[PDB]
Write a protein that binds this ligand. Sequence first.
Ligand code: CLA
Ligand SMILES: CC(/C=C/C=C(C)/C=C/[C@@]12O[C@]1(C)C[C@@H](O)CC2(C)C)=C\C=C\C=C(C)\C=C\C=C(C)\C=C\[C@@]12O[C@]1(C)C[C@@H](O)CC2(C)C
Ligand SMILES: CC(/C=C/C=C(C)/C=C/[C@@]12O[C@]1(C)C[C@@H](O)CC2(C)C)=C\C=C\C=C(C)\C=C\C=C(C)\C=C\[C@@]12O[C@]1(C)C[C@@H](O)CC2(C)C
Ligand SMILES: CC(/C=C/C=C(C)/C=C/[C@@]12O[C@]1(C)C[C@@H](O)CC2(C)C)=C\C=C\C=C(C)\C=C\C=C(C)\C=C\[C@@]12O[C@]1(C)C[C@@H](O)CC2(C)C
Ligand SMILES: CC1=CCCC(C)(C)[C@H]1/C=C/C(C)=C/C=C/C(C)=C/C=C/C=C(C)/C=C/C=C(C)/C=C/C1=C(C)CCCC1(C)C
Lengths: 228, 41, 229, 212
Amino acid sequence: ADRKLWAPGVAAPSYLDGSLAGDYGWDPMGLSSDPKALAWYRQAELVHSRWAMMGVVGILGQEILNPDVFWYEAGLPKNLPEQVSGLNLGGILAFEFCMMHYVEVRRWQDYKNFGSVNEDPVFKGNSVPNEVMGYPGGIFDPFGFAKGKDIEDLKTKEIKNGRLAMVAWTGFALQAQATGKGPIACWKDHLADPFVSNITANIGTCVIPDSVDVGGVNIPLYCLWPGQ
Amino acid sequence: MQNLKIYLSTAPVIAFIWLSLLSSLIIEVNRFFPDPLIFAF
Amino acid sequence: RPLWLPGSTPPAHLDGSMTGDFGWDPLGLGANPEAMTWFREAELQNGRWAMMGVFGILVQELVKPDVFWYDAPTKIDLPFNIIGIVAFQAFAMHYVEIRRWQDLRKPGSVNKDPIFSNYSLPEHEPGYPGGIFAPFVPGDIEELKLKELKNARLSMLAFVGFVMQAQITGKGPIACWTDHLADPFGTTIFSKAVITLGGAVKPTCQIPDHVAFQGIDIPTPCFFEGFWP
Amino acid sequence: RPVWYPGNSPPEWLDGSLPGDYGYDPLGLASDPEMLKWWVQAELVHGRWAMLGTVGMIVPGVAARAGGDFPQWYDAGKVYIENSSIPFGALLMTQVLMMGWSEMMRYYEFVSPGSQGTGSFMGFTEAFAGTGENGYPGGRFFDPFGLAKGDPAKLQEYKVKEIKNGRLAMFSCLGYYAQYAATGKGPVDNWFDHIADPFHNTCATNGVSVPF
Ligand code: CLA
Ligand SMILES: CC(/C=C/C=C(C)/C=C/[C@@]12O[C@]1(C)C[C@@H](O)CC2(C)C)=C\C=C\C=C(C)\C=C\C=C(C)\C=C\[C@@]12O[C@]1(C)C[C@@H](O)CC2(C)C
Ligand SMILES: CC(/C=C/C=C(C)/C=C/[C@@]12O[C@]1(C)C[C@@H](O)CC2(C)C)=C\C=C\C=C(C)\C=C\C=C(C)\C=C\[C@@]12O[C@]1(C)C[C@@H](O)CC2(C)C
Ligand SMILES: CC(/C=C/C=C(C)/C=C/[C@@]12O[C@]1(C)C[C@@H](O)CC2(C)C)=C\C=C\C=C(C)\C=C\C=C(C)\C=C\[C@@]12O[C@]1(C)C[C@@H](O)CC2(C)C
Ligand SMILES: CC1=CCCC(C)(C)[C@H]1/C=C/C(C)=C/C=C/C(C)=C/C=C/C=C(C)/C=C/C=C(C)/C=C/C1=C(C)CCCC1(C)C
């Protein structure tokens, strides 16, 4: 049934019912269709929503709990903590790749076919339970709720919080880019003197260096819009 | 392409094309081997 | 059945047949029954030389004296020339092999011992000569046959490591073994090169060209340095 | 079928089965059924020389970043006969001798597919016999890995890749020529020049393509 559609008068597209989680029946590009695309796009919307939700919290956690270290940088082996700083990022990235390349390929193949390998290799006596394409959690949910009680309602809260992040996190990347300020910092500026702290100012300046090199002349930074 | 060939096979076409192959050739033979009065070379 | 990719969908022409078939054909070379039989020998041949080869280098270094393997000079020295050996190498392997190669193409005709007759065996499997070649038979089953590939297919894959590692790292196989466990986050040749937009670093080959052997050039360059990371 | 310039229909004569047939004949040069099979080979040949030409241009270029002293594809002709050791005439006339043999052999299998592998060229029956399609010889020599022998459904799927990779190699190899005549520098040099300062290295800034 119509929950509430995004614009007041609109026709929900045919393929859009509201069977999925946060459906408002908004696909004006008509891009999702022939649901083999929908399944694919849904996966991205999830995966993006999740990394954003972790991202947004991780950025607030950085700046609040580490007042220095302007967030948008954080990468180069200066801001790094004491135990690190001398782990040679080229060896740090090495440690990451083989870890993510497995898990992601592990997830991708479980999109191709479905219910195919949800089971542990190695010990191979055990598996994650049934789902629909991207809701695992025998292990991935240890605490067992969102099983018997309302499930899709928690799914609904998952997207609506996720979509908020993807936009919010995007705000981070463009704010920190033009201002040169962490999220809670540029917020503090606004509350101080809004009329002159507004986006009206400090546009036309990306205020970012174009080199930012570590072990060489490396890593060109192309900003976003060509503000000088 | 069927009918474009048959037209290119008309009498005046070949008469033009094939003389312009002699004419060109006989012109360029005189470019590299100029002034040939007698066959002496 | 178990597959190289646990969720995969093995190609049509390859199902559960050959010893140790996990369903790996990006290019589909096995769809031809004649040629796949040929390729079936090569996998054993390349495997069975590499296995005996990779075990060579390792023993050649750790228990043995330590010179990572570019060496003509040895402590078995050079007992009979070189061109002496290569002379005998050709005729040796020539008989050894054009003999076995014929049991591939026209099977069974070779089983007889050429001088007298102890023969060999029935015709068996073209790439698994029984009898005198396999007296001991440690495992009793073709489980051991599948057990042979999975070793070799690793060793061949392992051998390429020895080349490339000994290209730029300029050290033997087990030298860089211990060198990694000491400060692991260094020396991945992941760290050691980048090539991002803009910046490109590559480690230079630690082995030179023109190695002097008995007054002979022997250019021996590195393997496609320009495309290294 | 996904034709080029969507919304039209293919020229009525070719809708047929050809690898990589998008219905593009805007001057209608396939209108002669006898001639079409001659163009289908013509493309296949160019597509195959393209794909070899492109790599032959890029690799010596890409090799030059690390050093290793090669020339660019242009003025690699001189550099060889600069150092010479064999005359230019002997080389170009060994071309025409050996090369002309293949082509004039490749031709009479197109004319009459039966011959060329009947025999009596040093034996070699069935290696040259040809597999029956226009530009695909198949066989022992031209096809050492025995591919295009097993599953045909996989084969027809290569024949599409070969063209589509060929049509791109041609259209790129038109770029190597044209962007040499303007910027006067190697293909990978340009691939770095535009990846370094994209803004002032673009096409309008070569001063040739956009005259004033
Ligand atoms: C929707 C329509 C629209 C459009 C098309 C634009 C377009 C533009 N706005 Mg704009 N704007 C809009 C709506 C719009 N705005 C609205 C609704 C607002 C809210 C009030 C603003 C508020 C606004 C501000 C506050 C500013 C702009 C600026 C700009 C320009 C930035 C271009 C740029 O970064 O070039 C990159 C390069 C330049 C602009 C350089 C031009 C200077 C000389 C003549 C050229 C030589 C410099 C060189 C080429 C650049 C690199 C070197 C550098 C180190 C200087 C661009 C022309 C900015 C501006 O003036 O330019 C940044 C600026 O400060 N706008
Ligand atoms: C905004 C966004 C997507 C917006 C997409 C939109 C609007 C698409 C809309 C449409 O398609 C629909 C809906 C319907 C169509 O009919 C119409 C259109 C219009 C086509 C994605 C952002 C997605 C953003 C994401 C996923 C961000 C993830 C960020 C992460 C993981 C950050 C990590 C770090 O911050 C930490 C954690 C620590 C730091 O120190 C270091 C780093 C590494 C930088
Ligand atoms: C790695 C290797 C092959 C890897 C091949 C792969 C992954 C192929 C995959 C595919 O084909 C399939 C599966 C299916 C297709 O759909 C897809 C492709 C991609 C086509 C061969 C190495 C094979 C390696 C071989 C044959 C080496 C033999 C020789 C040795 C070991 C001798 C060594 C010595 O002589 C020295 C060097 C010095 C002396 O001092 C000591 C001694 C050590 C002993
Ligand atoms: C073969 C080819 C390139 C071959 C490259 C070679 C050999 C490499 C040579 C080199 O390595 C050497 C020798 C020496 C090196 O040191 C240097 C070089 C010189 C580089 C390009 C073909 C290049 C061919 C190209 C680009 C053709 C484009 C044609 C188009 C678009 C035609 C379209 C139409 O015909 C249709 C399709 C249908 C009609 O109805 C409509 C129209 C429009 C008529
Ligand atoms: C969200 C966002 C908005 C603004 C920008 C952008 C639009 C691009 C987008 C950014 C997306 C992201 C996350 C991009 C990722 C960027 C980065 C920095 C990726 C990683 C870069 C650096 C890496 C791996 C490692 C570098 C270290 C190198 C080489 C070498 C170090 C070393 C030295 C110096 C020499 C020898 C020894 C050794 C160890 C090799």
